[PDB]
Design a protein around this ligand. Structure first.
Ligand SMILES: Cc1cc2ccc1[C@@H](C)COC(=O)Nc1ccc(C3(C(=O)O)CCC3)c(c1)CN(C)C(=O)[C@@H]2Nc1ccc2c(N)ncc(F)c2c1
Ligand SMILES: [Ca+2]
Lengths: 55, 254
């Protein structure tokens, strides 16, 4: 599943035994209840530009 | 950087400037508060290992605006497979002596997981390359941080689209081509070690390191970048390791 369109994950994807897939996030992010989206948990998450985010 | 534009202040907040004895050496990428990724070749000629400085939050080299943060480089980690004066395994992992403080102007770039990088990021066509390198081949270096959008090529396509010049190094599985063959846009030697950053679903990730080429923005030639996805496990294991006496460390690769 992870090979195709990142398994629908916003960030990381792990394939599991069968048709199971688990999305994961980089440190400073947490996974939303949709099981695909990553939301920042810290003030300065990696790979986000604050001057652009604060617009 | 040739044929790009000034990166608006704070829009490349992971960019690092490396200095030796106060002189411009190379670029780098901040990946957390204490670790910087650069190019191994940047350290081929260092003798004064104790005068190596990393500057974060830098934009304009002519003025101090208070957003800059300087840190001594405590450790330079290079793969055992890298040979000085050559091209393969062109990566260095730098430990800062004290962490940088994250601010609107100093933010790390995401170091991605290998699977995500190979399966997804490797297929994002355009990415950004940045630095205070040459604005023209045989020209002056930039006083303001520059950025350029470059398309990535499959290696077979890079070899086919390039001018068949003698004594030219091979493009290995530890590299990738990106840029243009028409001589208009490229990163330069002064940008060495700097980020090749890829945007995916609202977040930026480290995919390449400004590594080498055959003259800046030379017709028939693309820029060559270290393929960061090959080094994820090597980098992660080293970031969990204790510091060792002495600045330079050669670490086994894989
Ligand atoms: C690894 C390598 C780097 C470079 C040229 C050749 C080689 C190999 C073959 C031989 O290996 C070398 O030449 N090694 C080497 C070692 C130390 C230095 C430093 C120096 O300034 O002497 C120390 C700090 C960099 C230097 C080169 C300077 N220099 C020419 C470089 O950095 C240059 N970089 C780029 C980086 C990106 C380039 C791009 N996208 N489009 C066009 C270019 F042409 C580019 C040149
Ligand atoms: Ca400045």
């Amino acid at each position: 599943i992870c090979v195709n369109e990142n398994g629908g994950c916003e960030q990381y994807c792990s394939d599991h035994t069968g048709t199971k897939r688990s999305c994961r996030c980089h440190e400073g992010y947490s996974l939303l209840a949709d099981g695909v989206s990553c939301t920042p948990t810290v003030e300065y998450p990696c790979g986000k530009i604050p001057i652009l985010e604060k617009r | 950087i040739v044929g790009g534009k000034v990166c608006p202040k704070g829009e490349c907040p992971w960019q690092v400037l490396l200095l030796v004895n106060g002189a411009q050496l190379c670029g780098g990428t901040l990946i957390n508060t204490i670790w910087v990724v650069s190019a191994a070749h940047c350290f081929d000629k260092i003798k004064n290992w104790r005068n190596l400085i990393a500057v974060l939050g830098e934009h304009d080299l002519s003025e101090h605006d208070g957003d800059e943060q300087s840190r001594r480089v405590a450790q330079v980690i290079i793969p055992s497979t890298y040979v000085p004066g050559t091209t393969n395994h062109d990566i260095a992992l730098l430990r800062l002596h004290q962490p940088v403080v994250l601010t609107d102007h100093v933010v790390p770039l995401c170091l991605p997981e290998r699977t995500f990088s190979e399966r997804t990021l490797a297929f994002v066509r355009f990415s950004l390359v940045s630095g205070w390198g040459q604005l023209l081949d045989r020209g002056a270096t930039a006083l303001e941080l520059m950025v350029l959008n470059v398309p990535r090529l499959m290696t077979q396509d890079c070899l086919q689209q390039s001018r068949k010049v003698g004594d030219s190094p091979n493009i290995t599985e530890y590299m990738f081509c990106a840029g243009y063959s028409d001589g208009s846009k490229d990163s330069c030697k002064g940008d060495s070690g700097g980020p090749h950053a890829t945007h995916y679903r609202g977040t930026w990730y480290l995919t390449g390191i400004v590594s080498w080429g055959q003259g800046c923005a030379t017709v028939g030639h693309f820029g060559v970048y270290t393929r960061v996805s090959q080094y994820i496990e090597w980098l992660q294991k080293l970031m969990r390791s204790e510091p060792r006496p002495g600045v330079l460390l050669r670490a086994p690769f894989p």
